[PDB]
Amino acid sequence: SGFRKMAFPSGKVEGCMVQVTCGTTTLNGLWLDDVVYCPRHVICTSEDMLNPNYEDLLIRKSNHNFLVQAGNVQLRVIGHSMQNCVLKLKVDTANPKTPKYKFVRIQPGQTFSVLACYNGSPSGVYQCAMRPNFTIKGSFLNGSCGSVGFNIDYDCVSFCYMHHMELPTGVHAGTDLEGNFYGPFVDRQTAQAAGTDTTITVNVLAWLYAAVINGDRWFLNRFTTTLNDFNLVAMKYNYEPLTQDHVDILGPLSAQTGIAVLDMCASLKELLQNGMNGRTILGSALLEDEFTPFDVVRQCSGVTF
Amino acid sequence: SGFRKMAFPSGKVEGCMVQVTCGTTTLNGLWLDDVVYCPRHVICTSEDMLNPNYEDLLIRKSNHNFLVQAGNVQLRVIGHSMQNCVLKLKVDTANPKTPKYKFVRIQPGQTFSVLACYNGSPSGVYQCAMRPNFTIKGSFLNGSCGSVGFNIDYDCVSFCYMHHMELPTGVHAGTDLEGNFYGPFVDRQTAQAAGTDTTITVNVLAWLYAAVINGDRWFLNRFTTTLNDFNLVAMKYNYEPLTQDHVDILGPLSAQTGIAVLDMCASLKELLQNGMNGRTILGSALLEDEFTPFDVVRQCSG
Ligand SMILES: *C(#N)[C]([C][C]1[C][C][N]C1=O)[N]C(=O)[C]1[C][Si]([C])([C])[C]N1C(=O)[C]([N]C(=O)O[C])C([C])([C])[C]
Ligand SMILES: *C(#N)[C]([C][C]1[C][C][N]C1=O)[N]C(=O)[C]1[C][Si]([C])([C])[C]N1C(=O)[C]([N]C(=O)O[C])C([C])([C])[C]
Ligand SMILES: [Cl-]
Ligand SMILES: [Cl-]
Ligand SMILES: [Cl-]
Ligand SMILES: [Cl-]
Ligand SMILES: [Cl-]
Ligand SMILES: [Cl-]
Ligand SMILES: [Cl-]
Ligand SMILES: [Cl-]
Ligand SMILES: [Cl-]
């Protein structure tokens, strides 16, 4: 049947993307009801990008300094406010394409779909995971800020990420839709480095289950471990700890495949200590950690939206 | 910066996906204007899935044998005709969400986004390429037929694939939107084997250039090669031969990075000869062949 890196359908989010311009700076905004959300650094100027006083910059600004364009129609800004690192521009027209939505904050290891946009126009969609160091290994060029990450739960779009900046290593940092950053980063153009990253162990296990569901079984072995032994091995290899909750969440996959979670942990421990021996798993020579247990179940059961 | 496997936004295609039911068979349809396109095997009976005479089967059908459901509303089928392996159900309502679109047949090596759907509703979007053996390495379950592959230029959707079947290897086969199968496959449940799958060499080279654009350097070397010497080595690794057409296409990436095409070809030969030695390229331990030169330019540049 096959297994692919798959993003949620992006149609609901596409109808909310607009272009936000504060003079020279142009980026994307998320138009929900009568409010447009965008990074607050759009008001920054090259005079002081190093240490911007955002509260005082916004005081100088009036509604007329913000140009919002939805397609080929200009949206009238009738108010503006700042919440954390997101600017909220109130517009005179509610978005007729507003879907059932909610703002959520995700945890490290959870995945989401990113709709990369430029000049308010969606250009691509891809699936990524919030890394344990709170960055995302995205793909973003100039003008991509305001692009959002999201999941879909039943009929409801869950907005979880808005893109703000790129770190010197090529990884990306952003905030939730309340403007609070993921990770210890600030929206200033100064030297900032992401912490050492680690592998999302629970996601690796779920991906191994996806392989077993697809007939890839060479890595299974007779052995089992307990959570204590595996966690000691995992930390030695820069792998995140596996909690009892992670075992519970992997439960349905364990029942489906006949491979207990600690049974699979024995396979993963051998893979870490001995390598792939030239073999591949689902066409990959590395252990994929950007599939949650829910992603694997959803793709192997055909959940739609 | 950063390089990701990236699909086109699927919204323009979501507005066209519908559910098509004939008898006890349900799959997906593509609703463009007043026509719904779906695989013609939706009318195939369980009695004879080996040698179905689809033309004979469709003559015995009436418009009332086809149920089309768009959202919560039922469309009325007012006509039906067959073009190759695709069934065309005319409906009484034109889709108000029909986008600017065209039908294109693609060549091996070309990439496109797939909107996997079930019961007429979008489930997910992913990227894949037409393999050299004319299959695709997709992700499909029961009831996924009718799902389409597409690309988007500006605001125009190029529909290039419709899913029809899964081969015993687990790879997938389908047609263009005019119903013509890619490769030597038929929409019958008969013994069918795909050819040996090979690597899309031009796509690998474009991906190496993408790595260089994104700061990777470790695989570069001082060597170069002739085109024929590169092909002789590469074919021993089940890599597709590289033509002068591929060399020309890689020209813009070559100029941007300052690395000649045959220079990069020498790097590829080294990677095939040596492996990775614990290193990765763009976060991957294998060479990736599902980014075209067009994909690389679009993602890396404006
Ligand atoms: C938006 N639009 C852009 C997108 C960036 C640039 C290329 N790739 C991306 O992801 N983001 C920015 O302009 C932000 C706003 Si700022 C706090 C005035 C600077 N900035 C940055 O991304 C900068 N990086 C940084 O300071 O991280 C420590 C760079 C990339 C411009 C140096
Ligand atoms: C549609 N809907 C399905 C989706 C398939 C089945 C599981 N994974 C997929 O991608 N497609 C089919 O049922 C087709 C139509 Si048919 C000519 C009546 C049989 N078929 C098949 O995929 C079959 N394979 C085959 O005949 O290859 C020669 C199997 C997989 C159902 C035996
Ligand atoms: Cl401040
Ligand atoms: Cl305020
Ligand atoms: Cl993807
Ligand atoms: Cl920018
Ligand atoms: Cl064993
Ligand atoms: Cl999880
Ligand atoms: Cl689950
Ligand atoms: Cl793309
Ligand atoms: Cl035919």
Please classify residue B74 by burial: count the beta carbons closer than 10 Å to its beta carbon, then call 0-12 exposed, 13-18 middle and 19+ buried: exposed
Q: Tell which CATH classification among 1.10.1840.10, 1.20.1090.10, 3.10.50.40, 1.20.210.10 matches the domain A198-301.
A: 1.10.1840.10
Superfamily name and number for A15-99: Trypsin-like serine proteases (2.40.10.10)
State if residue B158 touches ligand 2 by the CB under 6 angstroms criterion.
no
The domain locations on chain B are 1-14+100-197, 15-99, 198-301
The protein residue whose alpha carbon is closest to atom 14 in ligand 2 is B165
Whether the CB-CB separation of A7 and B124 falls below 8 Å is answered with: yes
Q: How far apart are CA B253 and CA B208, in angstroms?
A: 10
SS3 A120: coil
| Alpha-carbon distances of B225 from B230, B232, B264, rounded to whole Å | 6, 11, 9
DSSP labels, chain B: ------BPP-HHHHTTEEEEEETTEEEEEEEETTEEEEEGGGG--SS-SSS--HHHHHHT--GGGEEEEETTEEEPEEEEEEETTEEEEEESS--TTPPSEEE-PPPTT-EEEEEEEETTEEEEEEEEE--TTS-B-----TT-TT-EEEEEETTEEEEEEEEEEE-TTS-EEEE-TTSPBSSS--SSSS---PPPP-B-HHHHHHHHHHHHHTT--TT--S----HHHHHHHHHTTTBPPPPHHHHHHTHHHHHHHT--HHHHHHHHHHHHHH--TT--BTTBSS------HHHHHHHH--
Resolution of the experimentally solved model in angstroms: 2.1
**CB within 8 Å: B7 and A125:** yes
Q: Tell which CATH classification among 2.40.10.10, 2.40.170.20, 3.50.50.60, 2.30.40.10 matches the domain B1-14+100-197.
A: 2.40.10.10
Task: Say how many C-beta atoms besides its own lie within 10 A of residue A170's C-beta.
Answer: 16
Which residue bears the tokens 């086969």? B173
State if residue B172 touches ligand 2 by the CB under 6 angstroms criterion.
yes
Q: Chain A, 153-212: which have a CB under 8 Å from a chain B CB?
A: 166, 170-172
Active-site residues of B, by number, are: 41, 145
Mutation site for B-interface testing, chosen from A113, A117, A118, A139 by largest number of B Cβ within 10 Å: A139
| Method by which the model was determined | X-ray
Whether the CB-CB separation of B45 and B25 falls below 8 Å is answered with: no
For a substitution probing ligand 1, which of A189, A190, A192 has the most ligand atoms within 8 Å of its CB?
A: A189
Longest C-alpha distance within chain A, in Å?
Answer: 69
Q: B1-14+100-197 and B15-99 share one CATH topology?
A: yes
Task: Say how many C-beta atoms besides its own lie within 10 A of residue A98's C-beta.
Answer: 16
Per-residue three-class SS string for B216-273: CCCCCCCCCCCHHHHHHHHHCCCECCCCHHHHHHCHHHHHHHCCCHHHHHHHHHHHHH
Q: How far apart are CA A228 and CA A90, in angstroms?
A: 52
Whether the CB-CB separation of A30 and A36 falls below 8 Å is answered with: yes
Ligand 5 centroid–CA A114 distance in Å is 9
The closest of B163, B168, B170 to B187, measured between CA atoms, is B163
Q: How far apart are CA B95 and CA B121, in angstroms?
A: 15
- Name the CA radius of gyration of chain A, rounded: 22
Whether the CB-CB separation of A227 and A205 falls below 8 Å is answered with: no
SS3 A173: strand
Tokens of B279: 């290193």
Ligand 3 centroid–CA A183 distance in Å is 18
